[PDB]
Design a protein around this nucleic acid. Structure first.
Lengths: 134, 127
RNA sequence: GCCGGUCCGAUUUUCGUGACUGGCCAACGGGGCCUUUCCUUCUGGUUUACUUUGAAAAAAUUAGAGUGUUCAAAGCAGGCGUAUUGCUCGAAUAUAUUAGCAUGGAAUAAUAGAAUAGGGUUUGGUUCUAUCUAGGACCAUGAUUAAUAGGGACGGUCGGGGGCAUCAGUAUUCAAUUGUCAGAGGUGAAAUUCUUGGAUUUAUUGAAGACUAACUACUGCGAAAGCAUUUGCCAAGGACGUUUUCAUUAAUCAAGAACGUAGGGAUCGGGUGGUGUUUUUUUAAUGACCCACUCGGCACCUUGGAGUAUGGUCGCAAGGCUGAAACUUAAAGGAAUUG
């Protein structure tokens, strides 16, 4: 395989060319959340809107705990919801034209990769069990 | 894998090749105290634990004196009246080399183990 | 330990000592105090595997011990006195533990585990200052790091990856219409076949299905079989980029399921930097080549058998001019034949 990832630096504080307060970032991220944007998109729009590194550095904690604190939690986590959305999209395309055997293969693979994460989420019990992908 | 076994395999085959400074990426405080007691015995030179937050890396400036290190992957209980059997089964002689055990102070060799009069499980041998 | 001072004597400064005093400085230790800030959540009405123990431990059991059974195999003495409160000695030495009785301390490997995250309601209603305030209740929340472990977002891309439409090419076959005349085909030679109702060839078309010449390489993709015209749609995927998120979600495979040793050069895809030509400029977009670095790819180059022999066991060329024998026998043959 290959490596391509971020390299979060050695410092663990706000990078001191910052010229902005702490709760203003909280207001910005709850504003984007009430606009209805997913947490990873909050993270990139906060990397580029005003110069934060990420919220665990600039605020006191991560965006998932700060959105659960501000009351805008997601009922299912990001990767779970995105794999479900990809699964239903490729299922809709295959039911448009059933001859796509590569889409059948990829639907089986996405079903496996979502049942693995559903097994993890049920065994850690952060979503309510009986949840087994419809 | 076993991080201690792969670390000691790293410095073992780097010594077998004949390098001087060996990088050793996955570190832990067991490996720290392991090769701390082996540098007390003077089997390597000094070393360094570069601390980045994810795992920390190890660089050892070993000179020439190792010929084989290693671990034993079943870390079983070994009585005081059995380390003599284990030295005779692991090393080429009695006092030539060591075998370090995990015990109630922790990274002693067998000389210091019989001195302090404790024992425990065997985690690695070095000679 | 530093320094100032009450003094005695010398002095009108300063020193000797004996007292005694405080101002301060370091080393020791003692008693408290702050690091449980002031405010919300219990089961119901930290423990376990290592080292030292004693207790009961089966004679026999281990090993040991002194003794001239004449030695040894075996057996097992305390004897003297001062045979009168004592000597010189030996059955002193060494397992009943895998199982237990319970005790006592820390690394590893497990089992636990913090009663944190409010200085978050819409309303309802009480009194108390000279329209501003005070004090009551209901109504919507679960431990650090971010592996060159993993999956997910996002971005410019990337491919002859897939599915569905669509576009094309000249071939091949067939048909139509022209043209001119004896051959056309086919092979090593032929032959079959077709042909004056014009075969082959020529030209203008039209239809049909299949395939994608050259480009094509030690290059690209896909899990694999495989995958090469254009354009569009539908989804997917890979690498890279990333100061984005989650927090061990990982790997390995029965059953099942879908489809059928180290080094160097070059190249493809992505990114960074350089600074010349291609480029060009107020329409949008962000190309090519070179050089360095870097990540990932398809790749490359260099370090028991062999023989032989067989009086055995089993099969067998074995055995003679056929015809042809009970028959010296024909015809026809093979034989050698210059009769």
């Amino acid at each position: 395989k290959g490596i391509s990832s971020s390299a979060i630096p050695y410092s663990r504080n706000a990078p001191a060319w910052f010229k902005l307060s702490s709760e203003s970032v909280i207001e910005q991220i709850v504003k984007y959340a009430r606009k209805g944007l997913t947490p990873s998109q909050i993270g990139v729009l906060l990397r580029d809107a005003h110069g934060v590194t990420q919220a665990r550095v600039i605020t006191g904690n991560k965006i998932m705990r700060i959105l659960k604190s501000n009351g805008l939690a997601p009922e299912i986590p990001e990767d779970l919801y995105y794999l479900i959305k990809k699964a239903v999209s490729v299922r809709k395309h295959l039911e448009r034209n059933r001859k796509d055997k590569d889409a059948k293969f990829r639907l089986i693979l996405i079903e496996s990769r979502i049942h693995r994460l559903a097994r993890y989420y049920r065994t850690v019990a952060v979503l309510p069990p009986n949840w087994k992908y419809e | 894998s076993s991080v201690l076994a792969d670390a000691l395999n790293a410095i073992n085959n780097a010594e077998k090749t004949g390098k001087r400074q060996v990088l050793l990426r996955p570190s832990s405080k067991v490996i720290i105290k392991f090769l701390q007691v082996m540098q007390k015995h003077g089997y390597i030179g000094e070393f360094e634990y570069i601390d980045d937050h994810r795992s920390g890396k190890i660089v050892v400036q070993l000179n020439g004196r190792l010929n084989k290190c290693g671990v034993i992957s079943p870390r079983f209980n070994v009585k005081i009246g059995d380390i003599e059997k284990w030295t005779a089964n692991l090393l080429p002689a009695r006092q030539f080399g060591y075998v370090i055990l995990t015990t109630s102070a922790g990274i002693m060799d067998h000389e210091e183990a019989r001195r302090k009069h404790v024992s425990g499980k065997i985690l690695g041998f070095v000679y």
